[PDB]
Ligand binder design. Structure first.
Ligand SMILES: *[C@@H]1O[C@H](CO)[C@@H](O[C@@H]2O[C@H](CO)[C@@H](O)[C@H](O)[C@H]2NC(C)=O)[C@H](O)[C@H]1NC(C)=O
Ligand code: NAG
Ligand code: NAG
Ligand code: NAG
Ligand code: NAG
Lengths: 291, 295, 49, 49, 49
């Protein structure tokens, strides 16, 4: 059940830059060697994304807003971040959505949970790396949706070497449907955790007919407790290095380019500059001298 | 002179639907013991089954059967995806309020339909089932709320509304309303107050791998001839050929600049084919004048 | 340049709806009864003319 | 003008049962020539409300 | 003279209904339900084009 986890410091929010990240496939049609213009909710180019660390011990997991969608990215090494909760009050008085990943399989539930002060996970038994404790909610009385996905095996492995996992997600909630887009990338970081440059498109993953009102959310983290973690459930734990970034979507118009094989390789944000406005009017990525 | 165009004609017709055996569970929906209340309406997912349109016509009179974006007659010739059924019960007066773009208590505080809705609405009267002599009070609804609902949302929270200022904060006195009420369904009110049963079917068409589609039989597949094809309800005429492209698992069709389908995934063996018009031409006839010859 | 540009524009104007529910004739003829399909097809024909 | 500002917010109200107009937009909606019946009944006749 | 007259005609051509019920877009959108307001709006759009 619920324990109060003190002993983590207060620091102001850190910010970083979005080097053209967070673009997804808008439809389910094959196209090739074409420039297509679309209008939707995207993440603006060169935005300021909020940056969080889990390294005192710096356990930042506040309750963040949810305006029109969320771009969520996480660079990590040992599967410390597991899932999310979404809702409006989160106090058993209104419905709320839950996405969790145990050591076995994904769980999705839309129930009148009563979430207590600090949700988290424990155990990480020494030499065995097993998960046994599950401390998220206290009760789930009335509800209508429920889903347990296929079984898989999480190795529950620890890591301290060069970061090699970058996972990006996009969350949207429109007309009773909760849409998820996802992508994975192996990366060599070597550097102070600054969201590498590049271009990559996310692909649709799941659509859920939950039908609830969503205004806020929060992340679930598993905690490292063994011999080198002296103390009880409030002090005897280890951090493990992880970091995650949050940005917000807005309604834009984008110009996309498909190569011959059918993969999106470039984009133009038509509200970034005047030159982007020019390219987006001409429907080309190159311009010649003139006015 | 230019006269006409020559044009090769098709040889034969083929059909290619997926192979699914079991029928859809339309029984559990239209023949439930009791229906849910409008403020807590239900939703069921129908997928991976052969749909049918005759069984409805075969059972009890189901009047007020009106559809949006598709004619009721053609429902058996199509192939669907993401089919959902929402069922509830209301009074007979408010059945006109279930439509895309409307006003009234139900549309604003209980159940809104999106403006671009495509699907079918069914409603029929039920007095021998829901009305009891003393009046059924198990069917409730919501009367008060700050703001209207967005399409396809529900609200089961129960707390005292504060119409005026200075909230009373759970004492439930006057200047405060309990937002839920109840219907009286005495079997004596008349036609304008009978309890009516409503079902709303929603779906979208021809843009993704389909699983719920109607009863039809498949033909063998033929390549390299001008034929009449029909893939999951996408009719057309032309020549088919094995392709070199590479579809991702969530794609089924491929489109060109003019936005016309020109590649397709066969829904039995999962291979990609390419579609081409079979022949074209122009014909011109050279003559020396009928005053001279007829050659 | 002028010729090629004009022909490409003409080819690409085919992917417009002109108020109808779709830009494909066969799909309008399916999933609709005649006395309603006539309006959509009228729209498409006038646009292309 | 039919300002009921000191009507909807009054305490002594017991039966304001309004069947075609929600009591909020009474002011946002108009009417025509008004004719009001003021009279008394007894409790055994509040059935008539 | 020619240029001025052409521009005056073009501008004043914006107060015709071309068969719709009104020449004001917001008036068409309200007072009608969407699926038949859209045909009126398309009528106006074609006239102006
Ligand atoms: C993570 O959660 C899932 C969902 O509850 C667990 O899987 C179920 O666990 C209950 C517990 O008794 C069983 O009754 C069910 O049969 C399980 N579902 C199956 C097997 O599909 C899962 O066990 C949890 N993770 C761990 C490590 O226990
Ligand atoms: C679009 C954008 O970058 N907005 C601001 C930026 O101007 C500012 O410098 C930064 C804080 O450093 O916060 C963000
Ligand atoms: C919600 O739960 C409460 C308490 O268990 C119960 O009284 C109420 O009927 C439930 N509501 C629904 C819609 O199930
Ligand atoms: C596209 O596919 C072809 C054939 O598989 C391959 O040779 C090529 O490397 C791929 N990528 C590009 C950019 O052509
Ligand atoms: C969703 O919740 C917020 C906060 O409670 C509320 O202001 C908003 O009106 C709700 N959505 C709808 C459609 O009422």
């Amino acid at each position: 059940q619920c324990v109060n986890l003190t002993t983590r410091t207060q620091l102001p929010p850190a910010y970083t830059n979005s080097f053209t990240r967070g673009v997804y496939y808008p439809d389910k049609v094959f196209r090739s060697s074409v420039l297509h213009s679309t209008q939707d909710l995207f993440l603006p180019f060169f935005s300021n994304v909020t940056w969080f660390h889990v390294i005192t011990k710096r356990f930042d997991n506040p309750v963040l807003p949810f305006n029109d969608g969320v771009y969520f990215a996480s660079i990590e090494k040992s599967n410390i971040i597991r899932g999310w909760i979404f809702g409006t009050t989160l106090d058993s008085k209104t419905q709320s959505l839950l996405i969790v990943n145990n050591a076995t399989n994904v769980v999705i539930k839309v129930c009148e949970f009563q979430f207590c002060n600090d949700p988290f996970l424990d155990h990480k038994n020494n030499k065995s790396w097993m998960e046994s404790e599950f401390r998220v909610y206290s009760s789930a009385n009335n509800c209508t949706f429920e889903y347990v996905s296929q079984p898989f095996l999480m190795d529950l492995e620890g890591k301290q070497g060069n970061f090699k996992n970058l996972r990006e997600f996009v969350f949207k909630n429109i007309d009773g449907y909760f849409k998820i887009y996802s992508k994975h990338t192996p990366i060599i970081v070597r550097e102070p955790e600054d969201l590498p440059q590049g271009f990559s498109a996310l692909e649709p993953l799941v659509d859920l007919p939950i039908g609830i009102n969503i205004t806020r959310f929060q992340t679930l983290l598993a905690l490292h407790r063994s011999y080198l973690t002296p103390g009880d459930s409030s002090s005897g734990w280890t951090a493990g290095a992880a970091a995650y970034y949050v940005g917000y979507l807005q309604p834009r118009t984008f110009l996309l380019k498909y190569n011959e094989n059918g993969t999106i390789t470039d984009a133009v944000d038509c509200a970034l500059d005047p030159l982007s406005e020019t390219k987006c009017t001409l429907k080309s990525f190159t311009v010649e001298k003139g006015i | 002179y230019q006269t006409s165009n020559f044009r090769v004609q098709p040889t034969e017709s083929i059909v290619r639907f997926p192979n699914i055996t079991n029928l859809c569970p339309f029984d559990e929906v239209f023949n439930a013991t009791r229906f849910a209340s409008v403020y807590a309406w239900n939703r069921k997912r129908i997928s991976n089954c052969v749909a049918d349109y005759s069984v409805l016509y075969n059972l009890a009179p189901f009047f007020t059967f009106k559809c949006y974006g598709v004619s009721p007659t053609k429902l058996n010739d199509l192939c669907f995806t993401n089919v959902y059924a929402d069922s509830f019960v209301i009074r007979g007066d408010e059945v006109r309020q279930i439509a895309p773009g409307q006003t009234g208590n139900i549309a604003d505080y209980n159940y809104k339909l999106p403006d671009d809705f495509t699907g079918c609405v069914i409603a029929w009267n039920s007095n021998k089932l829901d009305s009891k002599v003393s009046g059924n009070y198990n069917y409730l609804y919501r009367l008060f709320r700050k703001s209207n609902l967005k399409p396809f949302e529900r609200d089961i929270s129960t707390e005292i509304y504060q119409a005026g200022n200075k909230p009373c904060n759970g004492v439930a006195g006057f200047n405060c309303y309990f937002p839920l009420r109840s219907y009286g369904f005495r079997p004596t009110y008349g036609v304008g107050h009978q309890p009516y049963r409503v079902v709303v079917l929603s779906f979208e068409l021809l843009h993704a791998p389909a699983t719920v589609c109607g009863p039809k039989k498949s033909t063998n597949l033929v390549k390299n001839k001008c034929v009449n094809f029909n893939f999951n309800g996408l009719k057309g005429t032309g020549v088919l050929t094995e392709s070199n492209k590479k579809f991702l698992p969530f794609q089924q069709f491929g489109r060109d600049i003019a936005d016309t389908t020109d590649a397709v995934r066969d829904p039995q063996t999962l291979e990609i084919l390419d579609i081409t018009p079979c022949s074209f031409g122009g014909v011109s006839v050279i003559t020396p004048g009928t005053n001279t010859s007829n050659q | 340049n002028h010729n090629a540009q004009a022909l490409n524009t003409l080819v690409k104007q085919l992917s417009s709806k002109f108020g109808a529910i779709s830009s494909v004739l066969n799909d309008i003829f399916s999933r609709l009864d005649p006395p309603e399909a006539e309006v959509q097809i009228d729209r498409l024909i006038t646009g292309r003319l």
